[PDB]
Amino acid sequence: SGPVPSRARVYTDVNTHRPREYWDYESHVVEWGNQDDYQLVRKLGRGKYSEVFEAINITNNEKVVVKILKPVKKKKIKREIKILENLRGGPNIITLADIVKDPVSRTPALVFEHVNNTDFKQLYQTLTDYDIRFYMYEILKALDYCHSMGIMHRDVKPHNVMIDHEHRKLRLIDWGLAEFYHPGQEYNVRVASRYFKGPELLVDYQMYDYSLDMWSLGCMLASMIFRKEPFFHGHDNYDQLVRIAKVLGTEDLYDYIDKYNIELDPRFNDILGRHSRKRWERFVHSENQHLVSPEALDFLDKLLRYDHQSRLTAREAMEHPYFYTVVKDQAR
Ligand SMILES: CC(C)=CCOc1cccc2c1-c1c(c3c(n1C(C)C)CCCC3=O)C2=O
Ligand SMILES: [Cl-]
Ligand SMILES: [Cl-]
Ligand SMILES: [Cl-]
Ligand SMILES: [Cl-]
Ligand SMILES: [Cl-]
């Protein structure tokens, strides 16, 4: 008797009901454009797997953004392209415009529609209480959408959110780690950045689902309302789970482990030890007092749960009272 199986609470079969070509990205044949249509203007930034440029389409003189992919497995390029194509046109999802390949070096590059925005990590430590709620809600729109389309983002973090703060616009970017959810499928746990990895990743439970993204969202919320960047500041992968356990307590962690019959590393179990749960108000200070409300703490508590199946879905989050006034002014 190994680990207990798990299934997503919502959107479980959305890919099952789709035609195979929707999610079988390996069979998909990529129709590449002409790189000559694009000339690079200047550098915008650089990820771990890409270099990002401002560019111009010399066929309609439109501004675009080009993301030149650093060499990874060809299977990962088709997955990212297929996911971006499936999500194209969704609320707050970056819009893929074209796919091009270098004539000589054969390096693939993604072409996106240009939006004069800035990175969320440069803003999210200075927002008003209402602005935290507002942009959290826009992030949730993107996550509920992509989850409803059968896709887990798996790398939700401040650096992967873009803000056009003058137009109050938001985009969820970097779909290079995203995957299609299929019930019963076992997934790789080497996803997400350390500070935003869910406990299922840290204990090597492979049958996870969309709820992984909700843990990452909870880490972002905690960082914003408490002004602690990151909130769980683990120094290696084991220490990341220790930091979590020093907050949520070890009791609910071991219940989670036992619930899914997860075999933990012998020395790891002794590493975790015993820690009581800390009240969320223990992290409130005089300088983040204006950002912390009872509804904020109740919402955060309902995202940061060890048991991935107990976390709020994206739609349940959007109906949490924490967004009540945000939702009311969404009608103007
Ligand atoms: C205005 C500033 C500060 C940057 C413009 O950042 C943009 C703009 C439009 C579209 C994208 C990015 C961007 C993307 C991506 C990244 N960046 C940034 C962080 C360079 C990081 C690597 C992964 C990725 O995918 C991406 O798709
Ligand atoms: Cl980040
Ligand atoms: Cl599998
Ligand atoms: Cl995977
Ligand atoms: Cl910490
Ligand atoms: Cl969801």
Author numbering: 2 to 333
Would you copy out the relevant sentences from the publication that reported this structure?
Protein kinase CK2 (former name: casein kinase 2), a serine/threonine kinase of the CMGC subgroup of eukaryotic protein kinases (EPKs), is involved in cellular key processes like cell cycle progression, evasion of apoptosis and DNA damage repair. Structurally CK2 predominantly occurs as a heterotetrameric complex with a central dimer of non-catalytic subunits (CK2β) to which two catalytic subunits (CK2α) are attached. For the catalytic subunit in humans and other vertebrates, two paralogous isoforms exist. They are typically denoted as CK2α and CK2α′ and have highly similar sequences with exception of their completely unrelated C-terminal segments.
In fact, the CK2α1−335/4p complex could be crystallized under conditions with strongly differing salt concentrations while the CK2α′Cys336Ser/4p complex crystallized only under low-salt conditions. Typically, crystallization conditions dominated by high concentrations of a kosmotropic salt support hydrophobic interactions. Therefore, they are particularly promotive for the closed hinge/helix αD conformation in which the hydrophobic C-spine is fully assembled. This rule originally derived from a survey of all human CK2α crystallization studies published at that time is further confirmed here by the high-salt CK2α1−335/4p-structure with Phe121 being embedded in the C-spine environment. In the high-salt CK2α1−335/4p structure this additional β-strand is enlarged to comprise now the zone from Asn118 to Phe121. This brings the Asn118 side chain out of conflict with the prenyl alcohol substituent of 4p. Significant conformational backbone adaptations of Asn117 and Asn118 are required to this end, but asparagine is well suited for that task because within folded proteins it is the most versatile amino acid after glycine with respect to the conformational space occupied by the backbone torsion angles φ and ψ. The lack of any conformational ambiguity in the hinge/helix αD region of the CK2α′Cys336Ser/4p complex is also perceptible from the final atomic B-factors which reflect the mobilities of the atoms in the crystalline state: they are low in the whole hinge/helix αD area of the CK2α′Cys336Ser/4p complex while in both CK2α1−335/4p complex structures high mobility sections exist, namely either at the helix αD (low-salt structure) or at the hinge (high-salt structure). Compared to the extensive hydrophobic embedding polar interactions contribute only marginally to the affinity of 4p to CK2, but they are critical for its orientation within the ATP site. As illustrated in Figure 3b,d there is only one hydrogen bond of 4p to the protein, namely from the D-ring oxo group to the side chain of Lys68 which normally serves to coordinate the α- and the β-phospho group of the cosubstrates ATP and GTP.
